Every structure is written in structure tokens, then in C-alpha cells.
Subunit: 152 residues, 3 copies
């Protein structure tokens, strides 16, 4: 689990848990203060127990190698804006299905919104997770046009 913080934002890029290791998963998330989990890949576990513990789970899958749709980006930035404002010091977790995968992508988008160029966001994440992004992802982050509407 890699943790990245920038302005009033703090993210936890985690691994996909299993219905079996769900209790320990929830236990850790709670300690990190995560209030929301965004699943950007296959949904592999039941979220009733997670939701019961006060952790809302959002399923926003986006085709691998494929860039997240504009709507996902807008929904993500909207989530970042409200959560870190209404719940000061909280954390948003994001995960894919087998290893970091494309989970780091949305985090990078949040950092770019925070004022970083995509290269900076990539380095900032890699400093925490050496193998963070793959070639295809770097190429589309290079073409990403930020809205730059978040205020800090």
C-alpha cells in the first residue's frame, strides 16, 4: 500500500482484497482514515461489510490501457473536492485488481489538478512505488488536458 499526500489530499493506493481478508483490509483502511474506496477495475468482493464500517465503495471501472472517460474524471475531481473539504485529514483509497495496475492513474490526475505537470505527478508517485505506471499510461497522461478548476 502506497500513500501519497499533496495539499489537503491524501490517497491510499492499495491492492484488491478478498472476501476472506476483508476484515484486516477494513481494519487497515480505518487506521489510514479512509472514508471512500474507488474500484477502477473488476469488482471482486462484497462491499456490505465495508459499507457497514462507514466506508463507501464506488465502482468506476475504466478499460485497461484506455484513458478514463471525461465523466469519470469529473466525478473523481468532484469527490476529491468534497471529501477532503468535508472530512479534513481523511483519505481516499483506490485499487485495481492484480497489483497497482491502473489504480495510480486517478491519483496522478488529482495531483495534476493540484498544480503538477504529469511528469511531476508520475515522479511523485514513483518515489513511493517504483514500478507505478506503464508505457501506455504515460503516453495518455502526456495528452491529458486538466480542467485546473480545483481551488486550494
Amino acid at each position: 500500500p502506497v500513500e501519497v499526500t499533496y495539499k489537503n489530499m491524501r490517497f491510499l493506493i492499495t491492492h484488491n482484497p478478498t472476501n476472506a481478508t476483508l476484515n484486516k483490509f477494513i481494519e487497515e483502511l480505518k487506521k489510514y482514515g479512509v472514508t471512500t474506496i474507488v474500484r477502477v477495475c473488476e469488482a471482486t468482493y462484497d462491499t456490505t461489510l465495508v459499507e457497514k464500517e462507514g466506508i463507501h465503495v464506488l465502482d468506476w471501472p475504466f478499460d485497461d490501457g484506455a484513458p478514463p472517460s471525461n465523466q469519470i474524471v469529473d466525478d473523481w475531481l468532484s469527490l476529491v473536492k468534497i471529501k477532503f473539504r468535508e472530512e479534513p485529514g481523511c483519505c481516499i483509497a483506490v485499487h485495481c485488481v492484480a497489483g497497482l495496475g491502473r489504480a495510480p492513474v486517478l491519483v496522478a490526475l488529482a495531483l495534476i489538478e493540484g498544480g503538477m505537470k504529469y511528469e511531476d505527478a508520475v515522479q511523485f508517485i514513483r518515489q513511493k512505488r517504483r514500478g507505478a505506471f506503464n508505457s501506455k499510461q504515460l503516453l495518455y497522461l502526456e495528452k491529458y488536458r486538466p480542467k485546473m478548476r480545483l481551488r486550494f
Copy 2:
């Protein structure tokens, strides 16, 4: 021991040592380059050995939960200003009595002074120590009015 660095500032939030483990405590502080220790809670150990090693100890206790008095904040900001300037690359350690406690509060104040909003300071610290601040502390950091007089 959590370490936080921002502009020309570097802080070490440590645990309260004992007269018995004082030697190892001093040994570590020296390696971190700390030149000053600020005790914000109960004074539990003799400081002669610490002072002899070139580490000045300051006792600035501030009430149960209660926000630090304006004078403590001014004294703290004055210490931050001169130490990191007169001793480039040094470190200021801060500790309470049983765990982190109120020790991260002053560090947050220094970060805010450095340009961060309190939420950013809280996240910046939490990235290093997950359970950093409690509800009461977050509430008064929210009401804290920085002087914003330190120059960088």
C-alpha cells in the same frame, strides 16, 4: 519517531524517553542533527546529560487539549526562524509524554506558517504518522489564525 521537513525546516516528533534509555535517545537525536528539544507535556527526565551533549531542552507545557497560548506560538515561531537559519540543516525535536499526544501540534503550526492551510499540514503529518491528530485538535487547528510573518 516521525520526521517532517518542509522549507529550511526539519522536525523530529519523538516519544518521551526515560532516564534509563537517555543515552540511546541522545545518540539518535545527534544522528538526526537535533540541536533543540521542546517538551510540551510533563517533564519526566533530567536534562543535564542532554544539555551536556549540546542539546538544549525547552519546557513549554500547554494544557490538556487546550490550544497553545499565543506566547508559546510566538516563542515557537521565533525558535523555528533562528535555529534553521543559524544552524542550516539542523533539526528541532518535539515530544509529549505517552505517544505522539500534542507534540505534532506545534509542528503543524510551523507548516501553516510555511504556507500550508491547516488541512494540508494535517495530511502532511499523517502521511508520516497515520494517527497523528485527534478531533479536539483538528477543531482548534481549524480556528488557528497564523501570523504568516516567517520569510523563506
Copy 3:
């Protein structure tokens, strides 16, 4: 190995390897995405294997502050590499421990906008014993070109 990242820059301050542990060395560098190695002290190992793996090795040996030419070459490398290879890493090492390896990294950070004290703290946060007195003194007198754009 300490890793420092600031703007579009990411550096790996490593230890001097041996011809014997060269394979594992290369394996790690590749995982960190390093494309270049700058050796600022004695050259102790053969670089054919390293160069073959796509990692260019530069010998810029320089106590004595790095010469203006070394600084210019270093800043030129920082400018082009992080631009032409987004997200890459530049490794730097001396001969026996951190040594003088951190100096050039500090210079890159100052170029990035940090005052030398900030650069020193930024590095020490990663490596407690980073710089020695002599080095702090000359970093204090260092006059940055401040020409790098971000």
C-alpha cells in the same frame, strides 16, 4: 539507496557496486527506471554490461567543489533526461557510502527553486547524515544559474 524527487526530477543516490554484484545492481536500477548513472568518484567497475542494458554511465569525478564544467554538464543532463524520458531516474554514487554523491542532487534541487538549506533538509529527511561541514559551507556560497524551466 535513497530516492529524492522534486519537480519532474527523480534521483537515486546509490552505493558503488562491484563487478560481481553488477547484475543485481542493474536489475534494481532498471526497476527504478534509471537511464543514466553519474559516477562522481573513483571508477571501480566495468560498464559494458550496464551500457548494454540501456544505462549510460558518465564519469565526472571531482573536499574540492565540482568544477563549473561538471555543474554545467550535470544541469544539462538533468534538463534533457527528465524531458526526453518522462518519469525516468538519474542515479549517482561515489565509492564508499553516500560520500559526495548528494552534492549534485542538492544542486539540481536548488535549480528547481530551493535555497540550499531547503535542499539539504530535503535530502537529510531521506539520509540523516547526508552532508558534512565543508560541503554545507560551499553549498552556502553556490550561485545557481536558475535557468531550468518547469
